[PDB]
Assembly symmetry: C2
Homo-oligomer: 399 residues x 2
């Protein structure tokens, strides 16, 4: 059997630790034997980024924008500990933050659902996608302890100068000031609109604009503006926009059948991506995809580098690390590249490999992370390589 | 059945007030020799007194230690027109809350044939909300064009922080919170947890907010340190967490803890977690103070839409369960404070009578969508209290 021809390149970003180990196996067992595919390769392993003073990350980001579809392996974000461990020059910045900013993108988290690994919320029959506005607010704020009897003002200073009284302290406390940006919020809404049209799902956005009548209102107003500018496009895709109050939204989410994109401001999105992921089960089944306003797509698994399985691997051991999310990053990228190039055999292949993973799990062949979520409970689990071998087997059955 | 000391009783509004009277005269008073220190916080009585009976009610509670409050109307423009008021008076709940320096705790009532939407949740999750400050007392502004925005602290120490240099347009916000308020919050949480014998989970994003969220983290720990002996005695563990970790863990847990939340978080999570349990009709609510005062209330409102039907001569299926458990909560707390273990035993029996009513298939309408297996029919308000009465008589 001939390999399926992929017309245009996919940009591939290699990563770190156990993620990197899985990545190599997926390519060799599940991807390269079946596809004649051009991969524009950037090694984003910590030592390559260290060697090039992180310039390789920017080059990677440029390539993703250029070709339009990327697929990325998880990477170490160094803290002081990693600097010591890998003898780094510097605590380089998160490759993800660098790439996301370069691409003006928003990250969308969506669970893979499998019949025999049901979510922890009974109602949830369809994936809930979390899209987080990852700019500003608390994450770029400035703060101060206020001990004394004091007055605190926010000063706006140039065309129209103004002073606002934050608080007249009599006793002690703390103060915080934050900002966000029109352009940032517009890009976020635009990326949500793109993702929802692509996925054919409704958009829920929510704030507490009844309290925050300028700041939260701003996001509400911008989001609605962007939806209005895309009224027909949204309606053609069957996408409904639902603006809610944030506490109402959270209550309704938990109550729903799932199936929507929940667009969240920065802090809420940080919390809810984790909380909703938890409601679905294992992080091993969480996919992630960056989408930008200009239609650039970058697929990744939602989890990290899985360093503690990696430390076990370094001692010679097989692990039971779940490759499922990494596989679906590959198949997501492949499908997208296929849809763009107009090459339906490419989409078909991505469908078949995805189907092979799901068939593997539903047939009772799981890695260790899925075990406490199985129904009926599954007693046995296999190593990462056994799992990939079973996926390969089930792929062959469909080809 | 005696009850050594009085309880402060706060009458309310609309359908809530209607259930209130019904419950006293059918389920409480026929069984207990109590001095209720009565305050009518009905909107008409509040308007006449210029909101003073509200303040009067709160000063009585602080004195007598235990209060029980009916849902009241918080007036807006529509309500001013409806009841022909003087002003849109301030929320009684918010008025009392501040005076008593209390924090509110929400706890679902669990019932076997009305299961939560979250499978793992086997024990109630209490949400305690720090209902002062942050975005609720924030100051905000739209920013156009090139501009520099700054945070300026003035007086004992003088400080200017660049918030942002704007090239395009955007928005800014500044907020505050207070040492005292956060301490009172932590104190109330510790009181509640010791009373309920549950663990305390507190969480922030102090890995990002290294001064502001850290302040809450440090103060909460300080207050736990101050009371570690009694906490250890009651079997209460304190578990500080990162906020996003906590939320993931809560959904993953079997319930059973108090989750203390900062203002915004608590606004969201109270509703979210209530939703995970089922019907708002099975939600109890208690204000605890740092000094140990308690005020028991239903979580629900006045149910105006049921009240209007009532005035039109229709029968409703309004749920009194939350109301009754506000009464029993008050009765039990007052029983244990004097040392009268018969008052407590009645509080138990009435709660257990309600639970037996529901579990036998006798429900109000609001429960129907949640019951498992589903109940084909529902009973009215009057009929539900009558069955609760039957089932209480069976236990006495
Ligand atoms: Na998070
Ligand atoms: Na709320």
């Amino acid at each position: 059997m001939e390999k399926v021809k992929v017309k245009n390149p996919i940009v591939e970003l290699d990563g770190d630790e156990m993620a990197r180990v899985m990545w190599k196996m997926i390519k060799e067992k599940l991807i390269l034997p079946y596809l004649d595919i051009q991969l524009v390769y950037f090694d984003l392993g910590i030592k390559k980024r260290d060697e090039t003073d992180d310039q390789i990350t920017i080059e990677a980001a440029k390539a993703i924008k250029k070709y339009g579809v990327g697929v990325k392996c998880a990477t170490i974000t160094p803290d002081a500990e990693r600097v010591k461990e890998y003898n780094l020059k510097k605590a380089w910045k998160s490759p993800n933050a660098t790439i996301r900013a370069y691409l003006d993108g928003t990250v969308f988290r969506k669970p893979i659902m499998v019949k025999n690994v049901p979510p922890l919320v009974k109602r949830w029959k369809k994936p809930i996608i979390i899209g987080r506005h990852a700019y500003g607010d608390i994450y770029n704020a400035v703060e101060a302890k206020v001990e004394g009897p004091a007055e605190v003002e926010l000063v706006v200073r140039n065309k129209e100068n103004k002073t606002l009284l934050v608080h007249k302290f009599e006793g002690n406390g703390v103060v915080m000031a934050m900002h966000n940006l029109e352009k940032s919020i517009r890009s976020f809404a635009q990326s949500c609109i793109n993702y929802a049209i692509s996925e054919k799902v409704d958009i829920w956005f929510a704030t507490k604009d009844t309290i925050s009548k300028v700041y939260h209102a701003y996001f509400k107003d911008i989001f609605q503006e962007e939806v209005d500018k895309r009224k027909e496009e949204l309606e053609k895709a069957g996408v409904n926009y639902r603006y809610m109050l944030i506490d109402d939204a959270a209550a309704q989410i938990l109550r729903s059948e799932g199936g929507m994109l929940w667009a969240c401001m920065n802090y809420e999105g940080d919390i809810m991506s984790d909380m909703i992921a938890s409601g679905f089960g294992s992080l091993g089944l969480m996919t992630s995809v960056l989408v930008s306003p200009d239609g650039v797509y970058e697929f990744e698994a939602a989890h990290g580098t899985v360093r503690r399985h990696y430390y076990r691997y370094l001692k010679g051991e097989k692990t039971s690390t779940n490759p499922t999310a990494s596989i679906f990053a590959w198949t997501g990228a492949i499908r997208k590249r296929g849809e763009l190039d107009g090459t339906p055999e490419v989409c078909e292949f991505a469908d078949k490999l995805e189907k092979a993973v799901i068939n593997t799990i539903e047939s009772g062949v799981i890695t260790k992370d899925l075990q406490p979520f199985t129904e009926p409970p599954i007693d046995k689990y296999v190593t990462l390589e056994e799992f990939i071998d079973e996926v390969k087997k089930n792929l062959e059955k469909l080809l």
